[PDB]
């Protein structure tokens, strides 16, 4: 009988064009909220849901909200980036009041994936202090990090690779996160997906080389790259397990070239040469070009790979980014003769 | 009735006595809400070396001034004299 009082409480927050107000309950579960945000397509509807239900959102609701923001970014035509940015600013104090007091590693990783998903190509930003503090708060306890999934940890790494400016790779909180995650993942190396190893290699290459404790951190990320890159090298060719994608081995090879260029002949480059030179048109060009830069910095010459990439080098057209690919591949070709 | 006993060394009667197996009980993190299930955090020593940094718990010596080992051996001879009466 108190539906009209409930409706007046709904009217006091959101204007009268919303379908949420008939649907409104005070005693909602977060499960239904994750589905109800999963049912909308327009940024007006998530705004309606936010001013109705700011009080009941835990971290899963924020993660589904950011995915729905990306969904509206690619499907709602009337997108305003300014309204999205002020709403994204409104998302902050709810996180600092709740999710930084009750965030398990699953929820926080899901949010950081959602925010990096928003910043993905097919510019919206959050403060980086919240991103680092979410990173240290999700990993503050060792035990749940021991029971974490490889998909979770490499997803967290891809989030930290996409969200952060390059000046903040030397921040100590990222290094504390990398300390915890290396101390977890080096025991369960063999539970890893090769895609998860690809993102682990890329993120430790991105964050690694950025007084005794810091050089020890660089040496520890050196042992992480050498063991993990040999884990991918063992996982390539061993046909008994799922064969890693040549894109992933190529991009982890580029990570090896990045950490070799920053810190200054593994089997990984040889097997990467094989999986590229058998399957070039499945490879995008720029990852292979970065692998040619890795061949440059190692000084090794992979013959059928380089003639195959010569054939790939002819097969591009003329135009700005494509001519930049041709130019840098020609430059690394002259670097290798 | 409780466990507390921080840092004791005992053995189990079923354990082979020259195999040198004995605990350093770390702490007690108990349930006093539930009285049958208990946990005894342990630095177990086996063959002298530490493994990890029911009925039948058997009371060995407690070194540290207390009741020392060779002192226990002399006094065990004097217990044998006590049943000798």
């Amino acid at each position: 009988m108190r539906k009209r009082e409930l409706l007046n409480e709904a009217r006091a927050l959101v204007p009268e064009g919303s379908g949420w107000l008939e649907a409104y309950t005070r005693n909602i579960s977060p499960r239904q909220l994750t589905w109800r945000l999963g049912k909308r397509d327009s940024l007006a509807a998530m705004t309606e849901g936010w001013q109705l239900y700011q009080g009941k959102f835990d971290t899963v609701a924020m993660a589904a909200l950011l995915r729905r923001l990306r969904h509206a970014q690619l499907q709602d035509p009337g997108f305003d980036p300014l309204a999205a940015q002020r709403l994204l600013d409104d998302l902050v104090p709810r996180l600092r009041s709740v999710g930084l007091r009750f965030g398990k590693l699953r929820d926080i990783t899901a949010y950081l994936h959602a925010l990096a998903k928003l910043r993905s190509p097919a510019l919206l930003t959050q403060p980086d202090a919240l991103v680092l503090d979410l990173a240290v708060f999700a990993t503050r306890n060792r035990t749940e990090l021991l029971h974490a999934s490889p998909q979770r940890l490499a997803t967290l790494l891809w989030a930290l690779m996409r969200l952060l400016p390059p000046q903040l790779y030397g921040s100590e909180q990222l290094q504390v996160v990398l300390d915890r995650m290396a101390l977890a993942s080096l025991g369960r190396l063999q539970n890893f997906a090769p895609l998860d190893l690809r993102w682990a290699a890329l993120a430790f290459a991105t964050f690694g080389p950025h007084e005794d404790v810091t050089a020890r951190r660089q040496s520890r990320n050196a042992r992480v790259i050498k063991a993990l890159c040999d884990e991918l090298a063992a996982r390539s060719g061993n046909l008994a397990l799922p064969q890693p994608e040549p894109r992933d081995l190529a991009l982890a090879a580029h990570a090896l070239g990045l950490v070799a260029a920053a810190s200054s002949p593994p089997a990984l480059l040889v097997k990467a040469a094989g999986v590229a030179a058998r399957s070039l048109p499945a490879l995008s060009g720029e990852e292979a070009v970065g692998l040619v830069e890795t061949l440059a910095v190692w000084g090794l010459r992979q013959p059928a790979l380089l003639e195959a990439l010569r054939d790939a080098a002819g097969r591009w057209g003329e135009g700005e980014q494509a001519e930049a690919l041709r130019g840098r591949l020609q430059a690394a070709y002259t670097r290798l003769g | 009735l409780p466990n507390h006993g921080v840092g004791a060394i005992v053995t189990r009667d079923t354990w082979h006595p020259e195999s040198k197996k004995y605990w350093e009980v770390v702490e007690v993190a108990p349930s006093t809400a539930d009285p049958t299930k208990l946990s005894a955090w342990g630095y177990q020593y086996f063959k002298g070396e530490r493994q990890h940094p029911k009925y039948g718990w058997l009371l060995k010596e407690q070194p540290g001034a207390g009741l020392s080992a060779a002192v226990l051996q002399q006094l065990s001879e004097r217990q044998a004299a006590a049943q000798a009466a």
């Binding site: 061993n238 046909l239 008994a240 064969q243 | 009667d13 079923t14 082979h16």
Partner: protein, 64 residues
């Protein structure tokens, strides 16, 4: 499994541990043998399929 003795229960614990032992090395050889079998299975149906021959048969039918 045993309690409060030291004569011939060591034999029982010895056979106990050796039985579970040799079961575990059986289990390891079991791994290596099935993994080898999966290696030739995906070696065979990664060796020939996906080739241009299916396109040759298709282009022969379509030229007909």
């Amino acid at each position: 499994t045993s309690n409060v003795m030291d004569e011939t229960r060591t034999k029982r614990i010895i056979d106990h541990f050796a039985y579970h032992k040799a079961r575990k090395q059986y289990r390891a050889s079991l791994h290596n043998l099935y993994s080898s079998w999966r290696a030739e299975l995906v070696a065979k149906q990664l060796a020939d399929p996906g080739a241009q021959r299916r396109l040759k048969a298709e282009e022969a039918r379509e030229e007909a």
